[PDB]
Amino acid sequence: ANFLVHSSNNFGAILSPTNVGSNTY
Amino acid sequence: ANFLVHSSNNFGAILSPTNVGSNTY
Amino acid sequence: ANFLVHSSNNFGAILSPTNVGSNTY
Amino acid sequence: ANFLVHSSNNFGAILSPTNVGSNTY
Amino acid sequence: ANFLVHSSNNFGAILSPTNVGSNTY
Amino acid sequence: CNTATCATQRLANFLVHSSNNFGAILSPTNVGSNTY
Amino acid sequence: CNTATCATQRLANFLVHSSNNFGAILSPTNVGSNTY
Amino acid sequence: CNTATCATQRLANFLVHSSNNFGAILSPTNVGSNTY
Amino acid sequence: CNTATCATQRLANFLVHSSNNFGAILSPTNVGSNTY
Amino acid sequence: CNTATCATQRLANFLVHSSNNFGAILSPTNVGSNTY
């Protein structure tokens, strides 16, 4: 599972789940 | 599962589920 | 499952389910 | 299942189901 | 699972889940 | 403003000349508040 | 401003000349507040 | 400003000349506050 | 400013000439406060 | 400023000439405060 992010000006989430149970990448 | 993000100016979620159970990428 | 996002100015969700059960990408 | 998003100015959901059961991409 | 980030000006999360249970990369 | 998120922008007394264009040239975005 | 997030921007008395363009040239973003 | 996050920017009395462009040339970002 | 995070920037009386560009040329970022 | 983080920057009376560019040329960053 390849992940690529080219963020210029981030103010929130990108690949970041919130209030979850079992999380896996 | 390839992920690509080119975010210019983010203020919310992109690939980030909220209030979920078992999450997997 | 390939994912591509070119977000210019995001203020909400893109690929981020909310209040779900078992989520998988 | 290929996903492509070119969002200019988002204020709501795009590919983000809400209040669902078992979700899969 | 390869991870790549090219962040220009970050103010939020990128690959950082919050308030989760068992997290694994 | 009193206890009020009052984001403002102003553009004035300018001139924009374009010959060919494929995207926005004047699309400022103003958001008072974003709750998630 | 009193206890108020009052983000402001101003553009004035300028001139922008363009010949070919594929992206934004004047799209400033103003956000009073972002709650996540 | 009194107890108020009051971020401001100003652009004035300038001239921008462009011939070919593929990205932004004037897209300043102003955010009063970002809560996460 | 009184007890207020009041970040400011100013650009004035300048001239920018460009011929080919693939990224931003004037995209200053102003953030009053960032809480995480 | 009184008990206030009041970061400021100023750019004035300058001239920028560019011929080819792939990144930012004027993108100053101003942050009043960053809480983590």
Curated annotation (Swiss-Prot), chains F, G, H, I, J:
Q: Which residues carry this modification: Tyrosine amide?
A: Y36
PTM description? Amyloid fibrils are degraded by insulin-degrading enzyme IDE.
Which cysteine pairs are joined by S-S bonds?
A: C1-C6
UniProt note: domains: The mature protein is largely unstructured in the absence of a cognate ligand, and has a strong tendency to form fibrillar aggregates. Homodimerization may be the first step of amyloid formation.
State what this protein does.
Amylin/IAPP is a glucoregulatory peptide hormone that plays an important role in the regulation of energy homeostasis. Selectively inhibits insulin-stimulated glucose utilization and glycogen deposition in muscle, while not affecting adipocyte glucose metabolism. IAPP function is mediated by the CALCR-RAMPs (AMYRs) receptor complexes. Amylin can also bind CALCR receptor in the absence of RAMPs, although it is more selective for AMYRs.
* Subunit record text: Can form homodimers. Interacts with IDE and INS. Interaction with INS inhibits homodimerization and fibril formation.
Family to which this protein belongs: Belongs to the calcitonin family.
Q: What is this protein called?
A: Islet amyloid polypeptide
This chain's source organism reads Homo sapiens
The range of the complete sequence contained here reads 35 to 70 of 89
